[PDB]
Amino acid sequence: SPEFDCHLSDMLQQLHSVEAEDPACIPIFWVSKWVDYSDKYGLGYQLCDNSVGVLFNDSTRLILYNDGDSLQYIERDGTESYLTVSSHPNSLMKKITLLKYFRNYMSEHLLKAGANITPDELARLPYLRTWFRTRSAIILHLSNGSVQINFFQDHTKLILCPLMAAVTYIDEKRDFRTYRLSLLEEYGCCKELASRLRYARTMVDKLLSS
């Protein structure tokens, strides 16, 4: 279905037109940690529920649930299969090994982004659809429609949700604020948020046009 990307294009349209805070719009899922081993292996990530995923170079995906045992494997054509750490096909040994290596690295060394974001609506576990980097940021596109942008220089982050029509901004002080895009469109926002939303427009355009 091209509905998600159309919602994303609709959000892009809204961003072009952009007391606007609304806690009812707080995201349920975002990327809290990531490791870029894309030269040889792929991109590993942690979601805020402590689940870990990898988008491998061969365009396959392996997802470990936060129970630390359950695994979903998604083949290139979209075929989904389920397995566990203890019960798995031999062909998946290397990919499982790599996921556990990434999991250990992130757990040992890395900060959990949005650890202070306060947690009714059904939470459906997404996977990483695609990602790319610029000099200034990493852009992460989740299967639920959400687009996350992490800025390297000041550690500020944006979480863009097309379904909720909302944006969450994590500032340098690690304080989070969630805004309704319609309220930003109608009333405007600070230059701090405005400048990052301008860059986000370019990034989302890049994502959609590819």
């Binding site: 940690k33 870029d36 992130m106 890395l110 900060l111």
Partner: peptide
């Protein structure tokens, strides 16, 4: 960087 904030 090759990883998120340490």
């Amino acid at each position: 960087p090759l990883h998120s904030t340490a």
